[PDB]
Amino acid sequence: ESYLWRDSEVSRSGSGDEPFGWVPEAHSVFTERILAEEPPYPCYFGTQGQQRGNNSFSAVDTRYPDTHGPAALARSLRAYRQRAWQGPKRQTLIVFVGPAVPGAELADDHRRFWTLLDELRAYDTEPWPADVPADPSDPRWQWCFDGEPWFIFAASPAYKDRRSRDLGPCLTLVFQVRRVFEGIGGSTVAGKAAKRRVREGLARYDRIGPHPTLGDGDTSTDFKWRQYTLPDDDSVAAPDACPV
Numbered sequence: 001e002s003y004l005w006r007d008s009e010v011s012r013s014g015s016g017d018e019p020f021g022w023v024p025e026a027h028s029v030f031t032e033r034i035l036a037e038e039p040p041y042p043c044y045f046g047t048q049g050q051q052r053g054n055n056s057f058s059a060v061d062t063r064y065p066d067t068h069g070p071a072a073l074a075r076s077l078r079a080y081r082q083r084a085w086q087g088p089k090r091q092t093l094i095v096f097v098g099p100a101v102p103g104a105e106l107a108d109d110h111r112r113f114w115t116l117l118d119e120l121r122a123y124d125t126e127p128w129p130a131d132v133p134a135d136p137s138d139p140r141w142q143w144c145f146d147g148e149p150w151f152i153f154a155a156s157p158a159y160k161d162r163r164s165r166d167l168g169p170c171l172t173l174v175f176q177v178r179r180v181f182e183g184i185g186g187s188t189v190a191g192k193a194a195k196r197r198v199r200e201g202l203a204r205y206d207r208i209g210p211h212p213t214l215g216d217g218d219t220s221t222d223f224k225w226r227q228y229t230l231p232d233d234d235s236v237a238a239p240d241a242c243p244v
């Protein structure tokens, strides 16, 4: 009944022509990308999380929205949130949305991303957190679910220049609770070092530099919604235009 998988469990998601039958290969492509030796994947935190067994997985099968869709993903997210606090601080949930769509454009995958986040909100059993503004135009808005804010971003095969966000053939959602950044806040010595190290990785991996909405690298960032769906170029969305 649970669609929350550790690495060793992903193979039980599905086999052959059945729901999630495409998930084990998507899992393998993802791990190949994040564990690659040369050039290394730019986010060493993601690589370390994979190497240490701290990445969990789920999926959405768009052919079966009533049974393998947002209602099931809300259950998986609640289970993951418990895991994220019981285990180590730097855990990530990676959610593959498939089957893969040949030739999809990036704008289409971003639309599907925001639609899925909206559908998930309908299955939340907890009120919105009192410490996070509910207005998506507020500089400090963040997406919330099950009582706390998350960082959540979209990966897609349609990222051609921002190769770091091409994690395989499927739209992929990367969820983290905010304890993952504890100790690397933007004003901290370790936080500035973290951004330096990742951005140097991007300069050895991607065809385009760090996106401006990630900030200059010496402070924390507002309007985090724009980071969820980075464009493949240097365009900058209007701050009050979050699609939620």
Ligand code: HEM
Binding pocket: 034, 043, 045, 046, 047, 049, 055, 090, 091, 092, 094, 153, 164, 165, 174, 180, 181, 184, 194, 195, 196, 198, 199, 210, 214, 215, 217, 227, 230
């Ligand atoms: C499978 C897991 C992960 C993946 C796929 C991933 C992916 C990425 C990517 C693609 C970027 C480049 C910026 C962007 O596209 O948004 C990035 C930056 C970053 N990530 Fe990771 N990440 C993962 C896990 C983590 C974790 C667990 C942490 C916790 C410390 C973390 C902290 C950071 C930081 C600090 C940056 C730099 C932001 C900046 O330069 O402004 N990541 N990550």
Ligand SMILES: NC(=[NH2+])NCCC[C@H](N)C(=O)NCP(=O)(O)O
Binding pocket: 151, 153, 181, 184, 185, 186, 187, 191, 219, 220, 221, 224, 227
């Ligand atoms: N993929 C990606 N950009 N991962 C890093 C997200 C960092 C988030 N925005 C965060 O809250 N960082 C702490 P801050 O103090 O604002 O830099």
